[PDB]
UniProtKB/Swiss-Prot annotation:
Its cofactor is Fe(2+). It comes from Homo sapiens (Human). This is Lysine-specific demethylase 4D. Fe cation binds at residues 182, 184, 270. Residues 136-302 form the JmjC domain. The modification PolyADP-ribosyl glutamic acid is found at residues 16-17. Histone demethylase that specifically demethylates 'Lys-9' of histone H3, thereby playing a central role in histone code. Does not demethylate histone H3 'Lys-4', H3 'Lys-27', H3 'Lys-36' nor H4 'Lys-20'. Demethylates both di- and trimethylated H3 'Lys-9' residue, while it has no activity on monomethylated residues. Demethylation of Lys residue generates formaldehyde and succinate. It catalyses: N(6),N(6),N(6)-trimethyl-L-lysyl(9)-[histone H3] + 2 2-oxoglutarate + 2 O2 = N(6)-methyl-L-lysyl(9)-[histone H3] + 2 formaldehyde + 2 succinate + 2 CO2. Keywords: ADP-ribosylation, Chromatin regulator, Dioxygenase, Iron, Metal-binding, Nucleus, Oxidoreductase, Transcription, Transcription regulation, Ubl conjugation, Zinc. Its main location: nucleus. 2-oxoglutarate binds at residues 126, 192, 200, 235. Zn(2+) binds at residues 228, 234, 300, 302. The lineage of its organism: Eukaryota, Metazoa, Chordata, Craniata, Vertebrata. The keyword Nucleotidyltransferase does not apply. GO terms for cellular component: blood microparticle; chromatin; nucleoplasm; nucleus; pericentric heterochromatin; site of double-strand break.
Amino acid sequence: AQNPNCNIMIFHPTKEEFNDFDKYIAYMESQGAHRAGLAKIIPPKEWKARETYDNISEILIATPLQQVASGRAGVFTQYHKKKKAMTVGEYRHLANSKKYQTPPHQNFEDLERKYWKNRIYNSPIYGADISGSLFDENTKQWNLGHLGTIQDLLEKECGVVIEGVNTPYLYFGMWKTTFAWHTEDMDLYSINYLHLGEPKTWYVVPPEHGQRLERLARELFPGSSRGCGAFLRHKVALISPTVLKENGIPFNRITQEAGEFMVTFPYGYHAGFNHGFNCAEAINFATPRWIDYGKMASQCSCGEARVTFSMDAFVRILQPERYDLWKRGQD
Ligand SMILES: O=C(O)CNC(=O)C(=O)O
Ligand SMILES: [Mg+2]
Ligand code: NI
Ligand SMILES: [Zn+2]
């Protein structure tokens, strides 16, 4: 069995190996990469996502989100307070202000210490989930707006044609902006490219140990757990590495820098934070190996998780027994 300790693997494809996206994912899996829940892909030196980032300031962040925390430093939830619209140039100036900028630090480890000590005492503003793409249309390799669609994968594997679309999303971050513990919708893969700016630190639980994280989360968030049998689908709960280590939960960590891709694998729980002003692009995708995870994915039916149009068909076809209850949660 490849990668039996479930370590995060880092890949360096050549320009020839970067042509065929599906084939390279399957290669990484042949080496055991999925056992970690997360992999890093460093693009060949010849590749670029686009020519420059000099002309992105007029993109609109229609609904910036202020991430307000409650709890203790290592165990907290966050809620998202909507703010007035602002452009990317306006948000970058805000991120760089004295109130929001990254503090002085020695290295990534010192910054990580400061994040976990101090996050809860601040409310950073995140531009998340903005439909769109920064890949040049002429970039042919690993262009997250040109991937094979999940609907087409389900149709190729299972024979059933379904409605729905699959497009990418932009994320504009600042120091302390936070992504809560989650797996993807329908336990899909994700791919995330850090276009520019400061790093993103990730934490991940191997898929084979995901239920250990869920059982800890029910203990640490007991009211939330009574409210919903899949409350991590709400994407609001944070647990620090120190608390995970105290409770014996297997995990790994890695920092993504600008120019790098990360892939999350089906049922790989992940969480993390941004080091300073940055922009990432991410999308969900599927492979044949996903289908069995989609059929077994938990679902939130309490009403909180509210998701895209396209998840309807995935529930309806892969989980027909759950469909009626889940759709009630959507309405
Ligand atoms: O970058 C972020 O805020 C969150 N991204 C992801 O969870 C992802 O790419 O799967
Ligand atoms: Mg612009
Ligand atoms: Ni994710
Ligand atoms: Zn719920």
